[PDB]
Design a protein around this ligand. Structure first.
Ligand code: SF4
Length: 209
C-alpha cells in the first residue's frame, strides 16, 4: 500500500466510510492547500456514475461535488436528458481542489491535475466504482476520460460512443463527453450546440442496458 492513495483507502465499500477516510488522505500533495476532500455524492444503487476532473472553488467549500455554475449547467443537461437523481453517483477524478490565485480575480483558479495526481487518486475512483457497480460511467472532460481510458485517449474523437475497457472493474459501459465548465465560455450559438451534444451523450449513457 505504498502507492498514492492506496493505503488511505479502507477495505470497505461503504460510501460514508470511504468519504470519511478520504477526508484524511495524503496520497498526493493536493490535500495541503485545499480546504477539504470532496468525495462523490449519491448512493450505491445508482446505475449512472459521472466523473469530473476535480472539485472547483465552490465545491471545495461546499464539501459536495458539482455545485457551481458548471454543476447548474449539468443539472440543465440531465433535465433535458431524462435522467433522474436517484440514478446518479457523481464524483471527480481528483478529490482535492488544485488551484492558484491571480490578483483581482473573482475566484480561485483551477489548475490541471497532473497525470501523477490522477493516478495517485485513482484508488478512490476504483473504490467508488466497486462500491456503486454502475451500469455506465460518464467521463466529463479529458482529465476524467484519461483516468479510465488511457493517457492517450482523446475525448474529441469518440463523442457519443459507448466504450468498454477490460481493466475497469465490473466492465461498465463508458461514455466520454465534454467538460461542462467548458460550456460556460464562448459564443451563445456554440455553447448551445455544445449543450445539445452533452445532452446527446447523457441520453446515450442513460440508455445503456
Ligand atoms: S487528491 Fe486524491 S490522492 Fe491526492 S490527497 Fe486528495 S484524495 Fe488523496
Amino acid at each position: 500500500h505504498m502507492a498514492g492513495a492506496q493505503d488511505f483507502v479502507p477495505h470497505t465499500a461503504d460510501l460514508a466510510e470511504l468519504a470519511a477516510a478520504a477526508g484524511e488522505c495524503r496520497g498526493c500533495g493536493l490535500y495541503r492547500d485545499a480546504t477539504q476532500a470532496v468525495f462523490g455524492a449519491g448512493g450505491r444503487s445508482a446505475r449512472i456514475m459521472m466523473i469530473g476532473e476535480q472539485p472547483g472553488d465552490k465545491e471545495d467549500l461546499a464539501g459536495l461535488p458539482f455545485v457551481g455554475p458548471a454543476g447548474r449547467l449539468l443539472d440543465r443537461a440531465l433535465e433535458a436528458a431524462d435522467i433522474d437523481r436517484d440514478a446518479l453517483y457523481v464524483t471527480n477524478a481528483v478529490k482535492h481542489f488544485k488551484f492558484t490565485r491571480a490578483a483581482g480575480g473573482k475566484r480561485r483558479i483551477h489548475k490541471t491535475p497532473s497525470r501523477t495526481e490522477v493516478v495517485a487518486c485513482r484508488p478512490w475512483l476504483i473504490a467508488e466504482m466497486t462500491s456503486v457497480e454502475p451500469d455506465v460511467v460518464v467521463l466529463l472532460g479529458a482529465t476524467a476520460a484519461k483516468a479510465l481510458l488511457g493517457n492517450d485517449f482523446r475525448v474529441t474523437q469518440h463523442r457519443g460512443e459507448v466504450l468498454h475497457v477490460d481493466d475497469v472493474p465490473g466492465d461498465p459501459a463508458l461514455v466520454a463527453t465534454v467538460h461542462p465548465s467548458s460550456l460556460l465560455r464562448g459564443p451563445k450559438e456554440e455553447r448551445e450546440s455544445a449543450f445539445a451534444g452533452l445532452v446527446d451523450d447523457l441520453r446515450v449513457a442513460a440508455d445503456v442496458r
